[PDB]
A = this chain, B = another copy of it.
Amino acid sequence: SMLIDLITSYRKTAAIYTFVDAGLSIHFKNGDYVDINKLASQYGIDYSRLNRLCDFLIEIGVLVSSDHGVALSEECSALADPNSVEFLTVKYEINSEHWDSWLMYPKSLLENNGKSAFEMVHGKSFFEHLDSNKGLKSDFDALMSKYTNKIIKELLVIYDFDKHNRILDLGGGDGELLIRISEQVKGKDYTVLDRYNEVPISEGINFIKGDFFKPIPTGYDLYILKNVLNNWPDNDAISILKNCREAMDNNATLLIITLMKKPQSLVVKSVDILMDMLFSAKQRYLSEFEDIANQAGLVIRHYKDLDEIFSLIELKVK
């Protein structure tokens, strides 16, 4: 009874989604028990329908039942606060943008053309779409901020940023990485390069409106590519790394912060197929990072894991 459960497990995602999307989850903070009848009235939902949804959520262990009402389980508490990796994943991923594409994914395999499953559906690139769909961009940036904040602590321990002067984050969106590093390391020129509609404003953090497919600005002694190359096939990844080498002098260092694919890595493997669907891209093994680095004329000096799924790679021009 494993296979049928794997196939129908999507309904649990969908049930969690409707509970978040209808704005009900916000009422379940501090494991507080809430009355289904009063919740139905607040949002003008048929109690009968809302009680049946809650019964399904009880069976999948999301909600717990009492004579006081229903509350979120200890394991599913994070549905309460909007700024959790769980809540923001529901907002970012559970929508037509991904689910229309997942349905088109089997066609993108059979029709081997330059179009990703997403491109076939939307008729644009994923990042071209985010320019239009503003709500999804803010959700994307919010989810990416959480994955940045898991890393800052071990990143600041493992790598020495204090030795550098000028730092450039290639594709750093809202400069969360650099904002968080600037918090624990002062006396540094922090700059973020990314394709912006409106350039983000800060103090101490510089924001360039550029493109890493065009020659990258010189002067920087530290370049960073955090969760970028996994959005680009080998030929496009090489293009980005070639421009990095050209922009780098002898002493300059390139930091790759990525989800490292390992023979045992479910979390990284599920995201691998997601990157294929969206960008026709992938997560890469250590050997695959060297392959694209060697073709760009860069050499791997250091590689170390930051946590269970994230890793760091130091590349220098040699």
Contact = CB atoms under 8 A, between A and B. Distances in A.
Contacts of A282: 48, 52
A279 to B, nearest CB: 12
Interface in A38-96: 43-46, 48-50, 52-53, 55-56, 59-62, 73, 75-76, 78-79, 85-86, 89-90, 93-96
A301 to B, nearest CB: 27
Copies in the complex: 2
A1 B75 contact: yes
B1 A109 contact: no
A49 B75 CA distance: 35
A92 to B, nearest CB: 10
A105 B3 contact: no
Nearest to A78: B3
Contact of A6 (B6, B12, B95, B102): B12
Nearest to A19: B106
A12 B9 contact: yes
Interface stretch (A180-188, A242-250, A265-273): A265-273
A90 B18 CA distance: 22
B18 A109 contact: yes
B10 A105 contact: no
9 contacts: A2-B73, A10-B14, A11-B102, A14-B102, A15-B273, A22-B109, A59-B265, A96-B103, A99-B100
The 4 lowest CB-CB distance pairs between A and B, nearest first, are: A10-B13, A21-B106, A2-B75, A10-B10
